[PDB]
Amino acid sequence: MSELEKAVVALIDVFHQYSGREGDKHKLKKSELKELINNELSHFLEEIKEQEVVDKVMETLDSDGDGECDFQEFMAFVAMITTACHEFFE
Amino acid sequence: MSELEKAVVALIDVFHQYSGREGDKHKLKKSELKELINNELSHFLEEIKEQEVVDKVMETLDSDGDGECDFQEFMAFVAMITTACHEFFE
Ligand SMILES: *[C@H]1c2c(ccc3c2OCO3)-c2ccc3cc4c(cc3c2N1C)OCO4
Ligand SMILES: *[C@H]1c2c(ccc3c2OCO3)-c2ccc3cc4c(cc3c2N1C)OCO4
Ligand SMILES: [Ca+2]
Ligand SMILES: [Ca+2]
Ligand SMILES: [Ca+2]
Ligand SMILES: [Ca+2]
């Protein structure tokens, strides 16, 4: 497999490390999204310590309105937190 | 860095390896998208040998209608072609 295919499989793996913990095993509820951001995105985002901050993050990404982050919405979230990076690649 | 972060950076890096070849350096035109799929996604997708297949993939990815695949749209494309994987992580 290519570097790209290995990165995609790695992305899916970590998403499931969090979505599979509670309730719907294929979506992140707020407590799972909080842990993923704090444990795994520490270079891209500030640690979340307040409930109101997690609420807003979820509200900003939850495009279909079900209260949870599915894989499609997570992938869009990954794109949003990378916006500043592209200029450095060009 | 975390496994997720390394994977995200790898995804951005391969996108730009193709998007930076011609024209808009931050989007994939049809030629760049075909090249990326054929060279980097050969486990997830069949080799593209027909113009109709390229046209259809671009049409399906291109949510803003500019004829090119930007990074957000690429993240959505990655999520689409990996749907069969998820059941292996629960
Ligand atoms: C984006 C970026 C990265 C890490 C953390 C971040 C952001 O935006 C805010 O939080 C990141 C990681 C790695 C690279 C590697 C290379 C880039 C840009 C990167 C970023 N950008 C700065 O350009 C070439 O290699
Ligand atoms: C997703 C899958 C893989 C290769 C080609 C594919 C798909 O779906 C459409 O075409 C793939 C590669 C690697 C892994 C690794 C592990 C998974 C699932 C994978 C897949 N699925 C089947 O679960 C645990 O590790
Ligand atoms: Ca869950
Ligand atoms: Ca949702
Ligand atoms: Ca281009
Ligand atoms: Ca587009």
From Swiss-Prot, chains A, B:
Keywords: Acetylation, Calcium, Cell adhesion, Cytoplasm, Metal-binding, Nucleus, Repeat, Secreted, Zinc. Zn(2+) binds at H16, H26, H86. Ca(2+) 2 binds at D62, D64, D66, E68, E73. The modification N-acetylserine is found at S2. Pfam families: EF-hand_1 (PF00036), S_100 (PF01023). Gene3D superfamilies: EF-hand. GO terms for molecular function: calcium ion binding; calcium-dependent protein binding; kinase inhibitor activity; protein homodimerization activity; RAGE receptor binding; S100 protein binding; tau protein binding; zinc ion binding. It comes from the Eukaryota. Dimer of either two alpha chains, or two beta chains, or one alpha and one beta chain. The S100B dimer binds two molecules of STK38. Interacts with CACYBP in a calcium-dependent manner. Interacts with ATAD3A; this interaction probably occurs in the cytosol prior to ATAD3A mitochondrial targeting. Interacts with S100A6. The S100B dimer interacts with two molecules of CAPZA1. Interacts with AGER. Interacts with PPP5C (via TPR repeats); the interaction is calcium-dependent and modulates PPP5C activity. Interacts with TPPP; this interaction inhibits TPPP dimerization. Small zinc- and- and calcium-binding protein that is highly expressed in astrocytes and constitutes one of the most abundant soluble proteins in brain. Weakly binds calcium but binds zinc very tightly-distinct binding sites with different affinities exist for both ions on each monomer. Physiological concentrations of potassium ion antagonize the binding of both divalent cations, especially affecting high-affinity calcium-binding sites. Acts as a neurotrophic factor that promotes astrocytosis and axonal proliferation. This is Protein S100-B. The gene is S100B.
